[PDB]
Write a protein that binds this ligand. Sequence first.
Ligand SMILES: Nc1nc(Nc2ccc(S(N)(=O)=O)cc2)nn1C(=S)Nc1c(F)cccc1F
Ligand SMILES: [Cl-]
Ligand SMILES: [Cl-]
Ligand SMILES: [Cl-]
Length: 350
Amino acid sequence: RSVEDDKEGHLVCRIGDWLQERYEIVGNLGEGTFGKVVECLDHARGKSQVALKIIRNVGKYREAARLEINVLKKIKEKDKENKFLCVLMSDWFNFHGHMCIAFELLGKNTFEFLKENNFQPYPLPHVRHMAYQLCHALRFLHENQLTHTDLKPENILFVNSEFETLYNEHKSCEEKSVKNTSIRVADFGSATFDHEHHTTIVATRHYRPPEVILELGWAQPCDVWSIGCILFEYYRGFTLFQTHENREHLVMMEKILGPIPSHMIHRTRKQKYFYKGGLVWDENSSDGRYVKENCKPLKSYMLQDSLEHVQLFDLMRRMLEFDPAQRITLAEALLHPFFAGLTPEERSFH
Ligand SMILES: Nc1nc(Nc2ccc(S(N)(=O)=O)cc2)nn1C(=S)Nc1c(F)cccc1F
Ligand SMILES: [Cl-]
Ligand SMILES: [Cl-]
Ligand SMILES: [Cl-]
C-alpha cells in the first residue's frame, strides 16, 4: 500500500484506513497547520478509543512533535497515576516521516463546545468548576518547574462533552449545557521547564501576557494571565482581547485593566509603544476606533451583581495583574473565596 502525502505534507488517510496494523481510523476530529487529529480504535488494547495526532511530513513539524513527545514523557514520569488532569500520551511513533501521538479519547474542547452552543456562555457554576480544575492542573505542573505557555480554550477538553438541551426562557432559544464539567489540559508542545531556553515570544496572541509583549522575560505567571483570559471567555462567550497586533493589544489592556505600571514601561526595550511615559496610538485608526468603542473596564462585563459573580471578577482581576511578580499565584488562587461555591464532589475531584 503506497503511503501518500498531499502537497503540504499531510498524510492522506480516511475513515476505514489503518496504521501499523493496529490503529483503525473511525473518525475525523480536527486539523491545524501541524497536520490532523483522527479518532482511532487501538486493536492492540481491546479496541480502546484514541485521538491520534498525525503530524505533517515536514522537518520543522517532525522536530516540534519530537520535542512534544519528550515533554509528555517527562510529565507522565512526574504524574504516574495520571492524577493531575493532563491529557497524556498512550503511544507515539514515526509513520513514514509523520510523527503520530496517540491520546486517550476525550470530548470536544471548550472552545468547540462554546461554538456549537452559538457562543452562549457557560453558566457560573460551570466556570467555577472549570477554573478550579485549571488552577489545580497548572499548580501541579508549576510545582514541577514547568510552564505550559499555550493555555487557551482549544487546549482544554471536556472528559465527556455530552450535553443537555435546555430551553432558556429569557432568551427564547435552546442552550446546550454540558452534563459533566470535568476537564483535562492538552497540548504540551510549547511547555518549558525552568532550566530550558525561554523563547522571547510565547503563547497564542489573545492569551499572551504583557511581560511577553514587552520582552521582560516570563515564567509560570504567563499561565496565570492566560487562565484569566480563559475564564473571561467562558463567562462571556467572547474573547477578552480580540487582537492581531501588539500596540492595539496593550491599549486594550489599559482600557480594560488600567494603566501599565511605570516600572514595566521603564524596563522594556520596546520603547516604540511609548511616548512620554504613556502608550502611543492613533485613536482615529480602524484599531483605535474599535478599541474605544468596544473595550471597557473589566468590572463592566459582570452579568450579575451577586456575591459569586463579584468573587469571580475579583479573582479574574488578580490573574490579570500587569506585573507578573504581583499577579496571583495558582496556589493563592485555590484559596480564593470564589471556590467556596464548589459542591463537595467538585472540590474533592469526585
Ligand atoms: N485526547 C483528545 N481527545 C479529543 N477528542 C475530540 C476532539 C475533537 C472533537 S470535535 N470533532 O471538535 O467534536 C471531539 C473529541 N481530542 N483530543 C486531543 S489530544 N486533541 C488535541 C488538542 F486538544 C490540542 C492539540 C492537539 C490535539 F490532538
Ligand atoms: Cl507551514
Ligand atoms: Cl516511550
Ligand atoms: Cl495617544
